[PDB]
């Protein structure tokens, strides 16, 4: 099958080292190593029901 | 079969080393090592019901 | 099947080592090693019912 | 069957070694080693009922 | 089936060595070694009933 | 059947060795060794009834 | 079935050896060895009844 | 049937060896060895009745 | 059935060896050796009745 | 039928050898050896009646 | 049924050999050997009646 | 039924040879051997009636 | 089958190290190493139902 | 099949190092290394239903 | 098969290092290394149903 | 088969280093390295249904 | 087959370094390196249905 | 087989460095390096259906 | 086979460096380097259906 | 076989340095380097169907 011979995969210290950073919500922020099946996704929404609006600002 | 021969996979110390940071809600911040089946996802929302709104600011 | 020959799988010290960090709610912050089935997810919400809103600030 | 030959799996000292850190609520902060079936999740919420709102700040 | 040949699995000393830290509420903070069935989860909430609000600050 | 041949499983000294720490409420802080069925969970809440709010600060 | 050939399972000295540490309420701080069925849980709450609130500070 | 061949299970000296520590209320702090059925839990609460609040400070 | 061949189970000297410690109330602090059925629990509270509050300082 | 072949089960000298230690109220602090049915518990409380509060400090 | 072949069950010398200790009230401090039915419990309380409070200083 | 083939059950010298140790009321400090039914308990209390408070210091 | 011989895969410190950054919502921000099947996606929305609008300001 | 002999693959520090940046919604921001099947996508919107508008401003 | 012998592949620090940048919605902004099958796409939209309009301003 | 021997494949710092930019909606902004099959596309729109217009300004 | 020996392939810093720029919708803005099959496309529109107009102001 | 021996291939800083530039819709603004098969295209339109007009101004 | 030995293949800074420029719709604006097969095309329109006009004001 | 030995192939700064320019629709504006097969084309149109007119002004 497929293979992977990566040396030095790092992927570390996600936040970057800035202070006062705000991490939003429903994100995918994972670090994944090794064979993966099923793919990688972001957050999912089903929007508000019964006429509720969805607002970003 | 799919292989993986990674040296130095790290993925450590997520927060980055900054202070006063504010990690989010429902995030997938995990670090995963080894064969994975079923995919990697962010957070999921079924939005408010009965005309409740969803608001970000 | 699938394999994993990883040397030095860190994933440690998640908070990053900064002080005054605030960790949010319903997150997935786990560190997972070994073969995994069923996928890795963030948090999940069924939003408020009967006209309650969901608010972020 | 899927294998795992990880040498040196850390996942330790989660908090990072900073002081005055404030850990979250309903988070998944576990460290898991060995074959896993059923998947890895964050926290789950069913939002308030009868028109109660859900608020973050 | 699946297998796991991990050498040195650490996963120890969760709090990180910081002082004045405040570990939160309903979190999953366990360290789990060995075959697992049924998945790993965060906390769960059924939100307040009868119009009670849920508030984070 | 799923195997596990982990050497040096540690998982010890949870609190991290810092002083003046506060371990919060309803957390899962266990260390589990051996084959597990039924999954690993955080704490659970059925939030207040009859219009009582749930407050974090 | 499943198996576990762990050498050196430790899991000891939970509090970490810090002084003035405060251990909170309803936690699961157990150390568990051997086959486990039924899963590992944190604390459980049914919130106050008749309009009493639940507060953390 | 599931096996377990753990060498050196330890699980000892829970308090950590620090002085002036204060262990909590209703915690599960047990050390359990041998095959377990019915799961491991934290403490359980039914909150106050008749409008009494629940307060952590 | 389920087996256990553990050598050196220890589980001893719970208090840790520190002085001036204050073991709390209603905890489970037992050390249990052998086949266990019915699960392991923390303490239980049916919170105060008739408008009495529950307070942790 | 389950089994247990543990060598050296110890579980001894509970208090740890520290001095001026206070062993608080209603704990379970037993050391139990052999087959067990009905599970292991902590202390149980039914809170005060008629508007009496429950206070920890 | 279940079996137990424990060698060296010990369970001895509860107090730890420290001095000036207070083995406080209503604890279960027993050491029990041989097959047990009906479970193991801590102390039990039915709290004060007629508006009397319960106070831990 | 259920068996017990233990050797060297000890369970002796409850205090560990410390000095000026003292014992609280209603403790269970028994050492029990052979088959048991009905379970092992700590002390039981029905708290003061008529508005009398229960106090620990 | 397809190969990968990457040296120095970095992918680290996602946030860039600026302060006061606000990571958004439902994003995919993962770092993925090793063979992948099923593709990589952004976030998904099923937009609001029953005449609710979707607003970006 | 296809091959890849990339030396020094960087892909790091996504945010760029600017402060006060506001990362978007539903984006794909991942860094992916190793052979990929199923393509790479942005976000997906199934726009509002029942006459709700979609507005970007 | 197709080959790739690229030395020094950058793709880093995506945002450019400017401050106050706003990252859009549903973009693809990933950095991808190694054999790719299935193609690379932007966002996808199905416009509002039932006579709702789509507006960019 | 087709080859690629490119030295110095930059493609970094997409945003350009200007401030106050808007990296607008549905774009494809990825940086792709290595052999690619399936083609590279922009965003896709199925325009509004049931007489809704599509508007740019 | 076909080959490519390009030295210094830049393609970097797309935005140009201007401030207040406004990147578009559904564009293809990717930088792609290495052999490509299936062609490079812009965005695609299936224009509004049911008599909805398409307007560029 | 066709070849390409280009020294210094730029294609960078697409926007040109002007401010307040507006990047339109569905464009192919990609930068492509290496062998290409399937050709390069602009955006594609299928005009509105059911008598909707298409307007540029 | 056909060759190309070009030195200094610029094609950069597309927008030209003027401000307030308005890049149009469905254009092909790519910069393409290396052997190309399938031709290079502008945008495509399948003009409106069912009596809709196409207007360039 | 054809050849090409151009020095300084330029093709840059397409917009021409002018401000307030308005680039057209469906154009081909690409800059292409290396051998090409299939020819270079402008835009393409299929005129409006069902009696629609095509108008330029």
Curated annotation (Swiss-Prot), chains A, B, C, D, E, F, G, H, I, J, K, L, M, N, O, P, Q, R, S, T:
Effect noted on mutating residue 35 to A: No nuclear import nor export
Segments forming a coiled coil: none
UniProt region (Nuclear targeting sequence (M9)), positions on chain: 28-57
Residue positions where Omega-N-methylarginine is found in the record: 44
Compositional bias per record (Gly residues), positions renumbered to this chain: 36-54
Residue numbers bearing the Phosphoserine modification: 45
Protein modification: Sumoylated.
Subcellular compartments: Nucleus; Cytoplasm
Subunit annotation: Identified in the spliceosome C complex. Identified in a IGF2BP1-dependent mRNP granule complex containing untranslated mRNAs. Interacts with SEPT6. Interacts with C9orf72. Interacts with KHDRBS1. Interacts with UBQLN2. Interacts with PPIA/CYPA. Interacts (via the RGG-box) with the HOXB-AS3 peptide; the interaction inhibits binding of HNRNPA1 to the intronic sequences flanking exon 9 of the PKM gene, preventing inclusion of exon 9 and promoting inclusion of exon 10 which suppresses formation of the PKM M2 isoform and promotes production of the M1 isoform. (Microbial infection) Interacts with HCV NS5B and with the 5'-UTR and 3'-UTR of HCV RNA.
Function: Involved in the packaging of pre-mRNA into hnRNP particles, transport of poly(A) mRNA from the nucleus to the cytoplasm and modulation of splice site selection. Plays a role in the splicing of pyruvate kinase PKM by binding repressively to sequences flanking PKM exon 9, inhibiting exon 9 inclusion and resulting in exon 10 inclusion and production of the PKM M2 isoform. Binds to the IRES and thereby inhibits the translation of the apoptosis protease activating factor APAF1. May bind to specific miRNA hairpins. (Microbial infection) May play a role in HCV RNA replication.
UniProt disease link: Inclusion body myopathy with early-onset Paget disease with or without frontotemporal dementia 3: An autosomal dominant disease characterized by disabling muscle weakness clinically resembling to limb girdle muscular dystrophy, osteolytic bone lesions consistent with Paget disease, and premature frontotemporal dementia. Clinical features show incomplete penetrance.
Identification of the protein by name: Heterogeneous nuclear ribonucleoprotein A1
Span of the entire protein shown here: 241 to 349 of 372
